[PDB]
Symmetry: C3
Subunit: 421 residues, 3 copies
């Protein structure tokens, strides 16, 4: 049996008192993680190559994920059964090298480690065939599914309905990778088409976006014993909410009963998204490693409820010895509410001493002792409709109740382990 | 560590729209599974032979089951802790070869793969001693437990009660197997006695069946590189509800509070059940494998709320190559309501292309692409008491609301993997 | 992958009827476990030495716990993710041999097996450095966390508050072990300081204890192919509720809303605890092994709601053969309510036949068949505030409703397995 996974766990304190607190700019879809993670998260994978005969083989893989608040010993939870798929290599004679697979699977996810941000993730129940050799590149095709809560109604008259149902969203993914564009440079192109797929009799409320597209281009350049990846993505309509390749075609639906059922007009995600990203990890000599990110993401919604986000961070690593190093992480976020036009910003500085299994910025396990400082100035926030956060923003100064954190300061510190095996 | 288990997961679509739908005749206790399974189910077993000294050994085994709807990546669930037992082989000197065990265990379950129907399953918390050598056969004794919700009351003044409690049902199982009846033929006999076992002070509402018997006879004939099993079972009263060997002695109990507590008269399971079954898996030459089922099951309840069920199916497998085949599954169900006398029927046809690790109809893992068509005509259904399904049936045409599917058609298609390791 | 853990599961019956019942004296913090365990409990640990280079290494360890009532086959549950930590050995050059670790961990727990009583357990999310060699002993430092529900409020005016929050309690642990006090005798000293650590803006209700201390001294004497441990422990204030090293600084807090929020007067745990314990396991010749416990524990609370507890038990084991033995367990408990002055007592006698993997009282797996008898006479009980048990006690004879079991008798019997691997 093959045992693999990922896990992080630790104990922390907030300067002003109590447990460690984590800092994320309101409106931002991520945070700089070093010394800024407040939960124990673990994915335990058990898999096995269940059959092999020549060049043909079947691999079985699973993944059970646990997320607990690390505030006590006994902490009950509802694990997420995230993967359970079979992959058969070389089964299709005329498509030598291709792999066919079916089941829940983390499918070719693309992420930026330091901000724990996935920018291309269509994972979920699915099937497909990958690595079809085209000579000049490798072609992969896949179809996965995600479902939204509600959104499908059996309308009797007008917008009055008898029943609701969860809406399934299908994604059809095509990728071409390994395009040798320049020396030590490679390019991958990808197209994603997603659409809400309603059961017979059910229909989406008026205004639902229903479908959308997403185009991805990623260039990888090998250098300084690492790489640099340049990404450009453009998503449209239904693909803008999740923004990683999954469709949210009924996003914005809602209803109210009085008992007559009324399906409100969908406050949809019609619009577009532009994401220009550049991140990498390289070695500057013998004593220094460096991870960095620079990203501009603009979700332009027709309903004007989007956000313009800029994020920049840097994580240098100084290697005192092969198993001990000092890390520093500095990250800046700036989010402009499309609605109010105001801006929220935050910068966090983290200094950590670390012992790790290897001399790389990528070596894990790692045991860290850190101190984090974050300063933010948030001018807007989402209107907090009593414990519920709304899609609408409002300036903090307006008497309206928002989830804004205002203008403040904080520092935390503690120990933590992180590992992938 | 020994890693074993079972798992199935896939993605599907319904011809008329949305996610895949699964077809099962109302009243039938099963459905023809090929291309007719709508969930990701997995059993992860981790066990180990923890001690061995000569012919003696102790094996530890566990089993954690997960069932998710495969409609998203992150799907939280409450896993079922189904097995955790220890088996000691050859510990009893005077009963050489016998195995003593205790703990939660899937005890000698008998099922028909194609319809995923267990017809002899007393699994649960238990203990026993198996494989006592009698020379002419092997004898096994076991006691397991199951518990029903409520059913036990502390009656103050006739049927008015102070407290309720869950009712434990004990089953005492005796099996004699390996009776060589004819060349390549073997016979196994089994007796099961089950009963509701109330705590002191508590009593079952008046009318409860309390106990029952079940007798099983199974003949196995080895042939055509497979087998054919002929099964005859007769169950009595408390053994008719679950109908696989577990007792439901307080089945039908209910109560209402107004606060005075009244235990209604138990609408019991007094009656009998007859099940005549024949299933098998054989090889017809080099290119063909075949699984088949034929079953008649009649639950005759004194109160007349039972069902008479006929099911017939066939699953031929044509082997294009050792790792690629085409499967066809045709299944028919006919269920007569004992109450109304009406009949429900359905036939489903499934065509699937498959790649599997081996050239057997039993080889797993397997990756399938299928198309399923089902036609049904249901004349009756259980009276749907608003989201709640009742024990009482009603003709679909009667203005009464039932869970009947009417007269209709549907087809689905998709990909799926299934594996046992 | 290293597979380890603990598990117990079985089936039982109560003489007077129904499922097995378990006997624990009201007021007592434990019960004599042999043939007195009513659930299936299992801890599945999967770990691995993920890196090794010379004398340095990193070990990754996990632990997922399951507790089910063993009353049916399919029993859903919410597993507890109890451990997830990394330990790096020999990473600190100047502290040779020391191990640094971080993550959720069962940290150096001290318990008495026969009563399943942990008397020194600060397990939970934490970090620390253990086994610092001082020459004359080993020094270990650790900080772990536990959190109480509520207890932290944002007071606006008087005991009126706007928001509540869970209260984190930090423990700072220091231990010195391996003090060679006499031939074959060793002594370990330990100090624990814990305190509720409130978030800025929040405060504990008035009356809360906030912090406390605990001092432990444990002497181990090796003899009769076993040992004898003598323990003396003294705890103060916040350390008295859990009483094993974890702090409960806001213990007793409560509130009521009418919507104005009022934080009641904390009915605190101010006071002290004295625990004098002696337990061991030794071999008396070839055919006899013996486990024993003798403990006096007195929780003296300022508010007089404490208890004075005496427990004594013995478990001899007669070895018929190397893999078969007969066990007897006799345990007595006596608990005096500090409030009422009344006493509750119970004695349970257990006779069990056992097959185990080894000839030790410590050998596991083990399969047992037992018969248990318990007699109790409880004069007091906690005031049962309708399903809810209060901190206040009342004599059974007083017309007040308490959770007292009165004066009675009961016997149970069944089979069970227990294993640690
Ligand atoms: Ca749950």
């Amino acid at each position: 049996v093959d045992f693999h996974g990922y896990a992080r766990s630790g104990i922390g304190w907030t300067g002003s008192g109590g447990e460690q607190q984590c800092f994320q700019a309101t409106g931002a879809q991520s945070k700089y993680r070093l010394g800024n993670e407040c939960e124990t998260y673990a994915e335990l994978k058990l898999g096995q190559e269940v059959w092999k005969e020549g060049d043909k083989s079947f691999y079985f893989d699973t993944n059970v994920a646990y997320s607990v608040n690390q505030q006590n010993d006994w902490e009950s939870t509802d694990p997420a059964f995230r993967e359970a798929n079979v992959q058969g290599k070389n089964l299709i004679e005329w498509l030598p090298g291709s792999t066919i697979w079916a089941g829940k699977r983390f499918y070719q996810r693309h992420d930026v480690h330091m901000i724990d941000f996935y920018y291309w993730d269509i994972s979920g129940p699915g099937a497909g065939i990958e690595n079809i050799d085209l000579g000049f590149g490798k072609l992969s095709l896949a179809a996965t599914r995600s479902t939204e809560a509600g959104g499908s109604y059996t309308f009797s008259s007008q917008n009055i309905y008898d029943e609701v149902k969860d809406t399934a969203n299908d994604v059809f993914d095509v990728r071409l990778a390994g395009l040798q564009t320049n020396p030590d440079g490679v390019l991958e192109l990808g197209v994603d088409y997603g659409r809400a797929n309603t059961t017979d009799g059910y229909k989406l409320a008026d205004g639902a976006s229903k479908d959308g597209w997403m185009f991805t281009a990623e260039h990888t350049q090998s250098m300084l014993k690492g790489y640099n990846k340049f990404v450009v993505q453009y998503a449209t309509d239904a693909m803008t909410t999740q923004g990683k390749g999954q469709a949210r075609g009924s996003d914005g639906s809602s209803s109210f009963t009085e008992k007559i059922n009324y399906a409100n007009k969908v406050i949809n995600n019609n619009g577009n998204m532009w994401r220009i990203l550049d991140h990498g990890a390289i070695s500057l000599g013998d004593k220094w490693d460096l991870m960095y990110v620079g990203m501009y993401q603009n979700i332009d919604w027709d309903n004007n409820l989007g956000t313009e986000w800029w994020t920049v961070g840097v994580r240098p690593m100084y290697k005192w010895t092969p198993i001990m190093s000092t890390l520093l992480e500095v990250g800046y976020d700036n989010v402009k509410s499309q609605q109010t036009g105001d801006r929220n910003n935050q910068y966090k500085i983290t200094l950590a001493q670390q012992w790790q299994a290897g001399d790389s910025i990528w070596s894990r396990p790692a045991i860290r002792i850190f101190a984090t400082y974050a300063k933010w100035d948030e001018k807007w926030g989402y209107i907090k409709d009593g414990d519920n956060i709304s899609r609408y923003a409002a300036a903090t100064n307006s008497g309206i109740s928002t989830n804004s954190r205002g203008d403040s300061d904080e520092w935390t510190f503690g120990a933590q382990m992180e590992i992938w095996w």
